[PDB]
């Protein structure tokens, strides 16, 4: 493991590589209490224990708190100068879309107030859409809040468009379908998962609550804590609940009946599980309160591994897109590990 | 399924798990429990300890700032609470207890006691007594019929009476009983342990005919007025008779219960048989065998039955209403026979739900309102679900098989 220090009056709320993008998946950023910070992983001569170290690059100032951050594929790099487009939730309950040139912002967009979330936003997401052409048609945001509602904002060529979908509960999580951008999922609070098309009822909705194996009874509270999609195609999804219980359900042939496959993680997952970017059957999840890290494959491969303990609190994590380094924030800091059997 | 069950635990509402007020009285509850109704219209619970050493009385409607009174006993009763009685007299609870010594016990609760602040009780409150020698023939089995006379009844097959002269003292008055000379029958023994034709229920009718019921189900009735048995039924003759097995009934239980002048006898022919004729003059009469709708074997045993004045059913063609509480372990039975004409030959068996929505939905997942996630939230969600008094007495279960709390997050004690 390397640890590199964060700023000594920067809090820590989000951390998140950006993968979604090529050009730029050595860029890291971390929103905190007054921005978001850009840092650059280079492989040094090092030794090739961790071959993998962490540049700090440099620090967008936005003067309140970063909660949640994604990076979107309009990312770019020239020489040198750093092209940034970020999606993130601020303060004031306003969901904002960010663009930069390194720590300058050049522009911004903000949706607020009554025409925004109506209470707490609990998640957004990024993907950009093209025409026939292949020209920047749209970039679209995702969020989903306490509100009950699911907002979706399109920022096109003619300017932005405004959609809002009611939610039977509050929405906790949302993520676009990789390789097709026209089908989305959000989660419920209540464990409801929703796929959607958001080009177009909406077309499916899946439930872990029911599902509960209760060899072991998952508890009375079983707050669902994430819904992801895997693969590359986004062939499959996966749910985990803040109780460490988890399901996964691939789309492919013939009929089907139940979910493909279910467990249960050796702790709470209070900030849900991290799919690995390039082994569909493991992802990652925290003990986020005593810094601990389970690796859970869904064949049970895994047999209980726990690569990561911290002696103290972690606050996010993500893998980098390489799959055998993972960089984790913690309250006053940001850590690259890596295991070596992924390599 | 015409009715649905409601379950009512009496503390939910509160953080106490017991009554501040309880008092303890000792003198020199989960085996048996019931309700009974007095003069001020408010309802008593009592309960007798599996051991039949503890009577606890609360008031159904003001449970936890009521008063509980548990009565400590100095030994268990001759045959748990068949050897127990509880009625109001005058502004009292009465109760007697035969005794496994032989001791017959009297309790004398005022009704003012029963719903005061007091932690104290004046006055005699309890009288020990030694009327008979129960020693030589044991009882099983004790019937109230007035506050000065009840009888007996012994596991030889034998009744004693017992008069009050003043307002403490008992007599036995035997009745005549030549039932014992079949013992001249090669097929008998006074000596022998089996063939006893003990009584296993009883009813009082219009304040004169005593009704039982035998081990092998004979209706026998005794005249009060004259101490002399006046009938003696054989219930079973009637139907088709079963040289293979009849179960003679092998423990007192609510076999039969009378409204005015039916009477519905439940007999054993796997376990399914209302018998019910009518009382009249004393002349008892049958009507009709009606069998029960039981399967899975049926494993099913009698708790309680209570026979009725007619309820607000989906079929207005009534005429009486049989309410059956049947048991096997602890999940419950509850049923309604409908009686639709004075012939109970035209009836109909009505069932309903015997476990309450609250536990269907957390057996079968079909609760979406609870809320999910954390471990302490589960934690939240079970206390407020369950109840202080069940949520102690399961943390209680837990370390007494040393099964202890991990950290904030296990979930494997959780599931526990």
């Known amino acids: 493991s390397n640890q590199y220090q964060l700023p000594l009056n920067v809090r820590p709320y989000t951390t998140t590589w950006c993968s979604q993008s090529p050009s730029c998946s050595n860029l890291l950023a971390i929103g905190h209490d007054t921005g978001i910070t850009i840092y650059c992983a ?287 924030a913690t309250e006053g800091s940001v850590l690259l590990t890596r295991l070596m059997g992924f390599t | 399924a015409c009715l649905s069950r409601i379950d009512a635990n009496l503390l939910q509402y509160y953080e106490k798990p017991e009554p501040n007020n309880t008092v303890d009285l000792y003198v020199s509850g989960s085996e048996y429990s019931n309700c009974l109704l007095l003069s001020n219209s408010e309802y008593i619970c009592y309960h007798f300890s599996s051991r039949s050493t503890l009577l606890t009385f609360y008031p159904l409607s003001d449970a936890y700032h009521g008063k509980t009174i548990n009565i400590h006993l100095p030994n268990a009763s001759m045959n748990q609470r068949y050897t127990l009685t509880i009625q109001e007299v005058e502004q009292q609870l009465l109760v007697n207890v035969i005794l496994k010594d032989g001791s017959f016990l009297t309790l004398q609760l005022p009704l003012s006691f029963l719903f005061s602040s007091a932690n104290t009780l004046n006055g005699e409150w309890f009288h020990l007594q030694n009327p008979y020698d129960f020693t030589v023939r044991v009882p099983h089995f004790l019937f109230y019929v007035s506050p000065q006379f009840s009888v007996v009844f012994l596991e030889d097959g034998g009744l004693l009476g017992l008069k009050k002269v003043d307002g403490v003292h008992y007599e036995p008055l035997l009745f005549n009983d030549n039932s014992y000379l079949k013992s001249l029958t090669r097929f008998f023994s006074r000596s022998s342990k089996s063939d006893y034709d003990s009584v296993i229920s009883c009813k009082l009718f219009h304040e004169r005919y005593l009704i039982v019921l035998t081990q092998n189900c004979h209706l026998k009735i005794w005249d009060l007025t004259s101490f002399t048995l006046i009938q003696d039924y054989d219930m079973v003759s009637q139907s088709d008779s079963d040289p293979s097995h009849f179960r003679k009934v092998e423990a007192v239980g609510e076999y039969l219960s009378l409204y ?46 209570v026979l009725t004045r007619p309820l607000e059913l989906n079929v207005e063609a009534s005429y009486l209403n049989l309410i059956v509480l049947w048991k096997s372990g602890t999940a419950s039975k509850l049923q309604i026979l409908n009686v639709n004409d004075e012939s109970f030959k035209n009836y109909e068996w009505i069932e309903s739900v015997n476990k309450s929505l609250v536990d269907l939905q957390s057996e079968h997942d079909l609760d979406i309102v609870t809320k999910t996630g954390d471990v302490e939230r589960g934690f939240c969600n079970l206390k407020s679900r369950y109840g202080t008094q069940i949520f102690e007495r399961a943390q209680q279960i837990l370390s007494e098989n040393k099964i202890i709390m991990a950290h904030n997050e296990d979930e494997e004690y959780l599931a526990n």
């Open chain 2, 260 to 305: 005015n002048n039916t009477l519905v006898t439940l007999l054993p022919l796997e376990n399914g048989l209302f018998q019910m004729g009518t009382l009249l003059v004393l002349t008892y009469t049958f009507q009709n065998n009606i069998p029960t709708n039981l399967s899975a074997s049926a494993i099913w045993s009698i708790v309680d039955l």
């Open chain 1, 42 to 328: 280079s492989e040094e001569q090092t030794p090739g224990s961790t071959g993998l170290t962490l540049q700090e690059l440099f620090t967008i100032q936005t003067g309140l708190p970063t909660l949640h951050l994604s990076f979107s594929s309009s990312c770019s790099y020239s020489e040198p100068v750093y092209s940034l487009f970020l999606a993130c939730v601020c303060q004031d309950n306003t969901v904002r879309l960010i663009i930069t040139k390194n720590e300058t912002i050049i522009t911004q967009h903000v949706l607020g107030g009554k025409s925004g979330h109506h209470n707490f936003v609990n998640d957004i997401d990024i993907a950009d859409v093209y025409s026939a052409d292949n020209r920047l048609a749209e970039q679209v945001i995702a969020s989903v809040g306490d509100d009950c509602t699911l907002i979706i904002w399109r920022l096109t060529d003619e300017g932005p468009i405004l959609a809002g979908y009611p939610l039977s509960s509050p929405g906790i999580s949302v993520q676009f379908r990789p390789s097709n951008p026209n089908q989305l999922i959000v989660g419920e609070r209540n464990g409801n998962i929703r796929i959607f098309d958001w080009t177009l009822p909406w077309l499916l909705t899946l439930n872990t609550l029911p599902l509960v194996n209760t060899c072991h009874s998952s508890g009375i509270a079983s707050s669902l804590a994430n819904v992801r999609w895997i693969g590359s195609d986004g062939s499959g999804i996966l749910a985990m609940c803040k109780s460490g219980a988890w399901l996964r359900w691939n789309l492919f042939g013939p009929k089907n009946l139940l979910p493909n496959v279910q467990g249960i993680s050796l702790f709470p997952s209070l900030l849900g599980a991290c799919p690995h970017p390039r082994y569909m059957d493991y992802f990652a999840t925290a003990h986020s309160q005593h810094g601990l890290i389970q690796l859970i494959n869904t064949y049970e491969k895994d047999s209980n591994s726990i690569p990561i303990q911290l002696g103290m609190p972690i606050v996010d994590f993500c893998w980098h897109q390489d799959g055998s380094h993972l960089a984790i």
